[PDB]
Amino acid sequence: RPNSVDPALRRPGRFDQEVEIGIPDVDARFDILTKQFSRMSSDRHVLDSEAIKYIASKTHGYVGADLTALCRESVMKTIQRGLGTDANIDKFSLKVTLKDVESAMVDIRPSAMREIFLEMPKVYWSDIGGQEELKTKMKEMIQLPLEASETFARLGISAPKGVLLYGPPGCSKTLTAKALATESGINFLAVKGPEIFNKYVGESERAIREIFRKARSAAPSIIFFDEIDALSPDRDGSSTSAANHVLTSLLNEIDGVEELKGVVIVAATNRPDEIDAALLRPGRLDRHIYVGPPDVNARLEILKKCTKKFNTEESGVDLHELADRTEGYSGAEVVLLCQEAGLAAIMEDLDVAKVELRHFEKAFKGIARGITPEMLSYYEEFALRS
Amino acid sequence: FKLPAEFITRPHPSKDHGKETCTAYIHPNVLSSLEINPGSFCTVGKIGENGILVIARAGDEEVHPVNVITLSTTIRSVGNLILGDRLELKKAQVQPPYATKVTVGSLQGYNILECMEEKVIQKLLDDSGVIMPGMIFQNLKTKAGDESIDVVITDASDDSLPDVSQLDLNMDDMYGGLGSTHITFSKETQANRKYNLPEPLSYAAVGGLDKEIESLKSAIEIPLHQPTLFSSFGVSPPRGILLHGPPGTGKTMLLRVVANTSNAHVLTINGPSIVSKYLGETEAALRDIFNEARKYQPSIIFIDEIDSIAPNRANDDSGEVESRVVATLLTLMDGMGAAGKVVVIAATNRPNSVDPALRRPGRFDQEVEIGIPDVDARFDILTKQFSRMSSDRHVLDSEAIKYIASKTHGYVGADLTALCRESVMKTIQRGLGTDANIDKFSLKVTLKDVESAMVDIRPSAMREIFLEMPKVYWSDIGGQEELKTKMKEMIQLPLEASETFARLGISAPKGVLLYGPPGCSKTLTAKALATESGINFLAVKGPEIFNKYVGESERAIREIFRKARSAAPSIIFFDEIDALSPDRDGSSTSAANHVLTSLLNEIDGVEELKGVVIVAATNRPDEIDAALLRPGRLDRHIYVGPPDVNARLEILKKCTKKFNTEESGVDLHELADRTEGYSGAEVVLLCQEAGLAAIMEDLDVAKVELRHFEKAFKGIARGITPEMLSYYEEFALRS
Ligand SMILES: Nc1ncnc2c1ncn2[C@@H]1O[C@H](COP(=O)(O)OP(=O)(O)OP(=O)(O)O)[C@@H](O)[C@H]1O
Ligand SMILES: Nc1ncnc2c1ncn2[C@@H]1O[C@H](COP(=O)(O)OP(=O)(O)O)[C@@H](O)[C@H]1O
């Protein structure tokens, strides 16, 4: 670390030349992997160019030492699998394949020790149900920065890089971020809010600084937060100085004498009035999305998707009357209702190819929406006030 | 002027016959320095155990270095001389008079050999030396029938004037070609307990950890015994294996066993003894040790208590011996050998306190975790321990061993060995006190002394993350059949219909909530479910995880969740959830909020735990945080209210089993009808009070009568109120 170096050495009269070797990118990692494979030659392995490219793309934050460790652990896993299964077969017969490498990179844990910006899984569009306005704003806020940099430079619009996601819990608040991680293809990173708190004091600040530096050096990406409602409230409720330090560090990173045009920061919150006034200021987190409960069409799509495994035609349900009746619920509520209906169907005679209407009615009667109109009124008041 | 201070042991090369007992390849300048005739005996100080093994000395071919010497694998096995022990050179003692008996043992065999004996005596004492209490040699080749048979000479009865002589060598004078007194072959005796020579403990003694035994076995003969197989790939093998776990699990006995079972050279370090004021002395010593290890291809490095040697960066910058040693060790073990055959064994207590730089896949990609033994492992350990003393020294049925293993829930292998030690202590002291010095062999081991041993041991592992609770069957169940069927279906879903869930996409809610009276029907039901389902059970209490320190509860919860996930699909149950869920109402500290958020985002957040099942039982559900009571997780709700008539009848019959129902005159129905709704705990208390009243009259009683029941019913109140039942019903209907 150059910071720990004595500034007397760090002088233009002494050390005017500085050589910095940053973290390898996708191209450098691919080159290193190709060189390593050429080093051990094609006798001991069979790897294609697309396989190496896929491995390099998957290892977004790994380093050359990490790549060598991955290759070594894949070698041990292949050797032990061959010994266990093939009963001491020829070494060159099994050589190196891709499944052992995938298992090794899954089990090795990513390069960032105790990282908080995790790589959450992806899911395709037809598995996503929600309103079209949120999807339109989604396409808005992804299409503007990627292919409007020149327009912003010529027009002075720049990038606000601030979007606030407030809405009822459990209804597609993080679904938009998940679909964005799937569709965009850019390296996505997500933080669980309460995970930032640890027993040690000061570790959170340095972890945030190092992960922000990694995001800056890892090409323009998108940054998303799961539940900022655990760190934002410091004046409404009692909190330690660590939370205030985290809040002011985040404020300085977002708009404190620094600008991050490449990356876009989006924050998702459950309670709308627990965000601190300093954090909720013009210039940051400007965009606000209602992202309320799913409409009739989204609920119908979710019901059809859940009933897709079952036989909808001979079950007698039109997939629309049930959705109309189940109007006060949400996506998660509909999902759990379908799960309970399936459980009631399977508890009768084990495997079933359908779900009965009486079982669905019983499940609906048993379960409750769990959502109160006063919270919706509070959300509306917050929307009008902001 | 050579001044040899320490010596190193090394196997005799080329095998064959040669000397094979009196090789003694010591360089001639060392022979002249000690001023002792080469054609005489010699001793290898081996840092202690004075007397050693007086063995005739010889000379080398001037190629053997001074540091290493040859004492023959026979003497290595006899004295348990592990390759790597520090040695010293001392002059020979007085010659012994003669031999008296000498008798073979014929280890690991059924004896009665005759056919393949073929006059062993000629080959038995054709070699020089041949100490009569100890010898081990290869089977060689006797007639047909190949196979492997070893001969041991355990028992000894010769008399030596100096008691310093540990193994009392004797002269050899046999008659043969190509007899002592009264032959030599007699019986298949084990190692004699009169002298009690050290034994080469193997994997047979270690039990209950076989699953990791195979893992360590693979870790030890992938790089070492098969170097060409790994070198065929050319990616270099890891040079370090990390062993960690709670103290007392037996890492050192295990590393000792794996060192003894391997004939290759090993390196051991005292640890803090190396630490010294001089900055470069430690570096030079470690570099010399590493160079010596590299010079001979078969070498294994053992580094015990490495945590103190390698402290964490942020924990403390103490000074003196510090990160410079860590850096030089990294640069060394990552710098010399490309393929080689070298492994470093690191033993530590707390992996977190160890340097994270060491805990990297680049050098320490192999991690070994040795958890505390479970019921099966403890039972195996006890069975091995009693098999060590065999049936001659004690008699105990396997049922008693299983009962003791079930009773011992938090004990470790060291704890069990101790427990046996004070069991023997209690037996000895009781025999001395009562029998007045009779032959105590007949008394042997019983159950009363062992029970007193569990009573008086008071193990220090009471505060542990793994807990076990006594098991009950369906007979002890008092409840309604509706909830029984519900929980049976719930437990049968993930274990049986996993493929149905996968194909239909229904999956499992993995959340069960049990709200009921604080009396009973939760803990006992959980006990019986654990007993019958056969799935691993973890008992976690509410106030137990709460302590003065802030953040320790979160770390403990994360650790227990991780090891439960990695310890096969198991059910997780919390005894008290109301002690942590209310945070806004009770103005709880940040630790409780962090714990609640962590459990919320781990039960059904970012990751799905399909294998494990989460079940919760608590009281007063309305006081908990609304975040936990959210749709999608813990959706299942069971009334689990007061027991019905059948449940109370069964409980009363079970409590009255020790009594005579027909003699007491009670019909087992009117009492339950009267006390139909209070609780089950008060029923148990009433039964205990009635029994106390019955035994108050004339000590032991063969019956309980009805007056005692009436007095117990009148004296003991209910303590239950309709308003809590109304509140529970209101909560049930609102959900
Ligand atoms: N699985 C086991 N098999 C046999 N003996 C065992 C086993 N586990 C523990 N022991 C006994 O434990 C005793 C001491 O073990 P040892 O001192 O090596 O523990 P350790 O786990 O390395 O120590 P610590 O964890 O406290 O640092 C030995 O006498 C040994 O017989
Ligand atoms: N089509 C679907 N089928 C099944 N599960 C889904 C589907 N869409 C979203 N989910 C689940 O719903 C969750 C949505 O999270 P969300 O409720 O937005 O977070 P929050 O609780 O912070 O509002 C995701 O974790 C995802 O696993």
Side-chain angles (χ1 to χ4, degrees), chain B residues 636-686:
Chain B
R636 196 56 189 166
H637 285 72
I638 308 297
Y639 192 53
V640 71
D644 45 354
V645 179
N646 295 16
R648 280 179 271 95
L649 192 147
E650 184 165 23
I651 290 298
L652 192 59
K653 282 198 314 183
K654 185 176 177 66
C655 284
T656 318
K657 177 170 57 185
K658 298 296 180 179
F659 306 106
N660 300 8
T661 73
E662 57 267 14
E663 194 183 4
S664 49
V666 287
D667 53 347
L668 273 300
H669 311 330
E670 193 260 338
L671 267 181
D673 291 358
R674 277 221 320 272
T675 317
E676 61 87 20
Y678 297 172
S679 86
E682 61 89 23
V683 164
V684 176
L685 174 65
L686 193 146

XYZ file of all heavy atoms in Angstrom, chain B residues 636-686:
401
model
N -46.753 -21.047 8.279
C -47.509 -22.100 8.944
C -47.750 -21.744 10.405
O -46.831 -21.318 11.114
C -46.769 -23.431 8.838
C -47.633 -24.644 9.143
C -48.867 -24.677 8.255
N -49.809 -25.713 8.664
C -51.062 -25.795 8.241
N -51.563 -24.913 7.391
N -51.833 -26.785 8.682
N -48.991 -21.920 10.855
C -49.383 -21.629 12.228
C -50.155 -22.813 12.787
O -51.073 -23.324 12.136
C -50.233 -20.356 12.304
C -49.447 -19.093 12.136
N -48.916 -18.702 10.926
C -49.102 -18.134 13.026
C -48.277 -17.555 11.077
N -48.375 -17.188 12.342
N -49.783 -23.247 13.989
C -50.426 -24.365 14.668
C -51.001 -23.857 15.982
O -50.309 -23.170 16.743
C -49.444 -25.526 14.912
C -48.734 -25.907 13.611
C -50.172 -26.727 15.498
C -49.664 -26.431 12.539
N -52.269 -24.188 16.241
C -52.919 -23.727 17.465
C -52.234 -24.291 18.704
O -52.022 -23.565 19.683
C -54.399 -24.107 17.449
C -55.212 -23.432 18.531
C -55.178 -22.053 18.691
C -56.012 -24.172 19.391
C -55.919 -21.429 19.677
C -56.756 -23.557 20.381
C -56.706 -22.186 20.518
O -57.445 -21.570 21.502
N -51.886 -25.583 18.676
C -51.183 -26.305 19.739
C -51.675 -25.872 21.121
O -50.892 -25.691 22.061
C -49.649 -26.160 19.571
C -49.140 -24.742 19.883
C -48.897 -27.228 20.373
N -52.993 -25.735 21.260
C -53.591 -25.263 22.485
C -53.553 -26.281 23.607
O -52.683 -27.157 23.658
N -54.499 -26.175 24.539
C -54.507 -27.089 25.675
C -54.762 -28.510 25.219
O -55.467 -28.746 24.219
C -55.653 -26.560 26.548
C -56.534 -25.814 25.605
C -55.614 -25.214 24.586
N -54.205 -29.496 25.920
C -54.422 -30.892 25.531
C -55.868 -31.316 25.732
O -56.586 -30.785 26.583
C -53.481 -31.669 26.461
C -53.295 -30.776 27.640
C -53.338 -29.374 27.105
N -56.292 -32.288 24.928
C -57.655 -32.797 24.989
C -57.754 -33.878 26.066
O -56.829 -34.099 26.853
C -58.091 -33.305 23.618
C -57.031 -34.150 22.942
O -55.910 -34.243 23.484
O -57.317 -34.721 21.868
N -58.899 -34.565 26.112
C -59.135 -35.567 27.149
C -58.179 -36.743 26.997
O -57.624 -37.240 27.986
C -60.605 -36.024 27.119
C -60.857 -37.080 28.185
C -61.534 -34.834 27.310
N -57.976 -37.213 25.764
C -57.107 -38.366 25.542
C -55.671 -38.065 25.951
O -54.994 -38.916 26.541
C -57.169 -38.793 24.075
C -58.540 -39.297 23.671
O -59.528 -39.069 24.369
N -58.606 -39.989 22.540
N -55.187 -36.861 25.640
C -53.822 -36.490 25.996
C -53.629 -36.477 27.508
O -52.637 -37.003 28.026
C -53.487 -35.124 25.405
N -54.572 -35.868 28.231
C -54.474 -35.825 29.686
C -54.578 -37.220 30.284
O -53.877 -37.542 31.250
C -55.557 -34.911 30.255
C -55.221 -33.436 30.165
C -56.348 -32.587 30.716
N -57.325 -32.248 29.686
C -58.437 -32.931 29.452
N -58.749 -34.008 30.156
N -59.262 -32.519 28.494
N -55.450 -38.063 29.726
C -55.560 -39.436 30.203
C -54.249 -40.189 30.008
O -53.798 -40.908 30.908
C -56.709 -40.145 29.481
C -57.187 -41.502 30.003
C -58.681 -41.646 29.774
C -56.443 -42.647 29.333
N -53.619 -40.028 28.841
C -52.347 -40.695 28.585
C -51.257 -40.188 29.522
O -50.460 -40.977 30.044
C -51.935 -40.497 27.127
C -50.665 -41.236 26.734
C -50.487 -41.331 25.232
O -51.070 -40.496 24.509
O -49.763 -42.240 24.775
N -51.205 -38.872 29.747
C -50.195 -38.308 30.639
C -50.392 -38.819 32.060
O -49.429 -39.187 32.745
C -50.227 -36.770 30.576
C -49.703 -36.279 29.225
C -49.415 -36.166 31.713
C -48.260 -36.650 28.958
N -51.643 -38.850 32.527
C -51.922 -39.337 33.874
C -51.595 -40.820 34.007
O -51.083 -41.255 35.043
C -53.381 -39.067 34.237
C -53.764 -39.258 35.705
C -52.931 -38.353 36.598
C -55.248 -38.992 35.909
N -51.890 -41.612 32.971
C -51.542 -43.029 33.006
C -50.031 -43.226 33.048
O -49.530 -44.092 33.775
C -52.141 -43.747 31.797
C -53.623 -44.062 31.930
C -54.051 -45.134 30.939
C -53.508 -44.855 29.546
N -53.979 -45.860 28.553
N -49.290 -42.435 32.266
C -47.834 -42.539 32.281
C -47.266 -42.146 33.639
O -46.338 -42.789 34.143
C -47.235 -41.670 31.176
C -45.727 -41.800 31.032
C -45.211 -40.993 29.852
C -43.696 -41.071 29.751
N -43.232 -42.448 29.427
N -47.809 -41.088 34.246
C -47.340 -40.671 35.563
C -47.728 -41.672 36.644
O -47.020 -41.804 37.649
C -47.888 -39.285 35.903
S -47.053 -37.923 35.054
N -48.837 -42.382 36.457
C -49.328 -43.357 37.421
C -48.821 -44.766 37.124
O -49.198 -45.713 37.824
C -50.865 -43.329 37.442
O -51.310 -41.968 37.405
C -51.413 -43.958 38.720
N -47.967 -44.924 36.109
C -47.457 -46.249 35.764
C -46.678 -46.860 36.921
O -46.802 -48.059 37.199
C -46.584 -46.162 34.512
C -45.948 -47.481 34.102
C -45.302 -47.380 32.729
C -44.263 -46.271 32.689
N -43.698 -46.088 31.323
N -45.868 -46.053 37.610
C -45.145 -46.544 38.777
C -46.075 -46.886 39.934
O -45.679 -47.640 40.829
C -44.111 -45.510 39.228
C -43.042 -45.208 38.192
C -42.186 -46.432 37.907
C -41.116 -46.128 36.872
N -40.251 -47.311 36.603
N -47.293 -46.352 39.936
C -48.277 -46.633 40.969
C -49.238 -47.724 40.507
O -49.216 -48.169 39.358
C -49.050 -45.362 41.334
C -48.173 -44.207 41.723
C -47.993 -43.137 40.863
C -47.527 -44.192 42.947
C -47.186 -42.072 41.217
C -46.719 -43.131 43.308
C -46.548 -42.070 42.442
N -50.092 -48.156 41.432
C -51.111 -49.163 41.157
C -52.440 -48.452 40.926
O -53.057 -47.952 41.872
C -51.212 -50.164 42.306
C -49.913 -50.907 42.547
O -48.879 -50.578 41.967
N -49.961 -51.915 43.409
N -52.874 -48.403 39.664
C -54.129 -47.734 39.336
C -55.322 -48.449 39.960
O -56.237 -47.802 40.482
C -54.297 -47.641 37.820
O -54.621 -48.932 37.291
C -53.013 -47.141 37.173
N -55.334 -49.784 39.910
C -56.459 -50.535 40.460
C -56.519 -50.439 41.979
O -57.614 -50.400 42.552
C -56.382 -51.997 40.016
C -55.092 -52.709 40.399
C -54.041 -52.640 39.310
O -54.202 -51.827 38.375
O -53.052 -53.398 39.387
N -55.364 -50.400 42.649
C -55.360 -50.305 44.104
C -55.737 -48.907 44.578
O -56.358 -48.760 45.637
C -53.990 -50.702 44.653
C -53.969 -50.955 46.152
C -52.580 -51.270 46.670
O -51.621 -51.222 45.872
O -52.446 -51.568 47.876
N -55.374 -47.873 43.814
C -55.718 -46.509 44.202
C -57.217 -46.253 44.099
O -57.749 -45.401 44.820
C -54.947 -45.509 43.341
O -55.061 -45.827 41.965
N -57.909 -46.972 43.218
C -59.339 -46.821 43.059
C -59.778 -45.746 42.091
O -60.986 -45.592 41.870
N -58.846 -44.998 41.507
C -59.195 -43.947 40.558
C -59.516 -44.571 39.208
O -58.896 -45.560 38.797
C -58.056 -42.918 40.445
C -57.994 -42.056 41.697
C -56.726 -43.618 40.207
N -60.495 -43.996 38.514
C -60.924 -44.491 37.213
C -60.175 -43.843 36.055
O -60.491 -44.135 34.897
C -62.430 -44.273 37.036
C -62.846 -42.839 37.298
O -62.029 -42.072 37.851
O -63.989 -42.477 36.951
N -59.212 -42.967 36.339
C -58.373 -42.295 35.350
C -59.164 -41.373 34.428
O -58.616 -40.879 33.436
C -57.570 -43.301 34.512
C -56.217 -43.782 35.048
C -55.264 -42.614 35.242
C -56.375 -44.572 36.341
N -60.440 -41.128 34.725
C -61.292 -40.288 33.892
C -61.814 -39.068 34.632
O -61.776 -37.956 34.089
C -62.473 -41.110 33.346
C -62.071 -42.414 32.729
N -60.852 -42.605 32.115
C -62.729 -43.594 32.633
C -60.776 -43.845 31.666
N -61.901 -44.467 31.968
N -62.312 -39.246 35.859
C -62.891 -38.130 36.600
C -61.846 -37.071 36.925
O -62.136 -35.869 36.872
C -63.555 -38.641 37.880
C -64.453 -37.624 38.563
C -63.774 -36.945 39.737
O -62.810 -37.521 40.281
O -64.207 -35.836 40.114
N -60.629 -37.494 37.274
C -59.573 -36.533 37.577
C -59.239 -35.678 36.362
O -59.085 -34.456 36.477
C -58.328 -37.264 38.080
C -58.206 -37.435 39.595
C -56.917 -38.158 39.951
C -58.280 -36.087 40.297
N -59.120 -36.303 35.188
C -58.857 -35.546 33.969
C -60.023 -34.627 33.626
O -59.816 -33.481 33.207
C -58.565 -36.500 32.811
N -61.256 -35.111 33.798
C -62.420 -34.277 33.516
C -62.444 -33.046 34.414
O -62.772 -31.944 33.959
C -63.703 -35.092 33.685
C -63.862 -36.154 32.616
O -62.998 -36.231 31.718
O -64.851 -36.915 32.674
N -62.103 -33.216 35.693
C -62.038 -32.072 36.596
C -60.908 -31.126 36.204
O -61.122 -29.917 36.057
C -61.863 -32.552 38.037
C -63.161 -32.943 38.725
C -63.187 -32.455 40.166
N -61.893 -32.611 40.819
C -61.498 -33.709 41.448
N -62.278 -34.774 41.535
N -60.292 -33.739 42.007
N -59.701 -31.655 36.032
C -58.544 -30.848 35.640
C -58.318 -30.948 34.130
O -57.250 -31.321 33.644
C -57.312 -31.292 36.423
O -57.674 -31.512 37.791
C -56.246 -30.219 36.382
N -59.369 -30.610 33.384
C -59.365 -30.779 31.935
C -58.564 -29.710 31.197
O -58.066 -29.978 30.098
C -60.806 -30.809 31.414
C -61.615 -29.545 31.687
C -61.436 -28.482 30.618
O -61.004 -28.829 29.499
O -61.726 -27.300 30.899
N -58.428 -28.509 31.752
C -57.910 -27.425 30.939
C -56.773 -26.586 31.485
O -56.322 -25.661 30.803
N -56.302 -26.870 32.700
C -55.280 -26.019 33.301
C -53.978 -26.050 32.506
O -53.620 -25.056 31.864
C -55.022 -26.436 34.752
C -56.210 -26.278 35.682
C -56.170 -26.775 36.977
C -57.369 -25.630 35.266
C -57.247 -26.637 37.832
C -58.451 -25.487 36.114
C -58.384 -25.992 37.396
O -59.459 -25.851 38.243
N -53.285 -27.194 32.522
C -52.074 -27.425 31.735
C -51.548 -28.831 32.000
O -52.090 -29.549 32.845
C -50.982 -26.393 32.045
O -50.192 -26.785 33.152
N -50.502 -29.236 31.286
C -49.862 -30.511 31.551
C -48.781 -30.417 32.610
O -48.556 -31.364 33.375
N -48.101 -29.269 32.661
C -47.067 -29.064 33.671
C -47.657 -29.093 35.075
O -47.068 -29.677 35.993
C -46.340 -27.743 33.419
N -48.822 -28.469 35.262
C -49.480 -28.542 36.560
C -49.961 -29.955 36.862
O -50.013 -30.346 38.029
C -50.641 -27.547 36.631
C -51.738 -27.773 35.612
C -52.819 -28.707 36.107
O -52.977 -28.842 37.339
O -53.509 -29.305 35.259
N -50.300 -30.738 35.834
C -50.642 -32.142 36.056
C -49.433 -32.907 36.584
O -49.542 -33.700 37.529
C -51.191 -32.774 34.764
C -51.187 -34.292 34.866
C -52.596 -32.272 34.484
N -48.262 -32.680 35.983
C -47.044 -33.338 36.455
C -46.723 -32.905 37.881
O -46.344 -33.727 38.728
C -45.875 -33.047 35.496
C -44.583 -33.647 36.030
C -46.184 -33.584 34.106
N -46.865 -31.608 38.167
C -46.614 -31.112 39.517
C -47.586 -31.721 40.522
O -47.198 -32.064 41.645
C -46.704 -29.586 39.535
C -46.609 -28.899 40.899
C -45.239 -29.122 41.519
C -46.907 -27.414 40.766
N -48.858 -31.856 40.137
C -49.850 -32.471 41.011
C -49.516 -33.931 41.276
O -49.660 -34.412 42.405
C -51.238 -32.338 40.384
C -52.475 -32.627 41.237
C -53.610 -31.711 40.817
C -52.899 -34.084 41.122
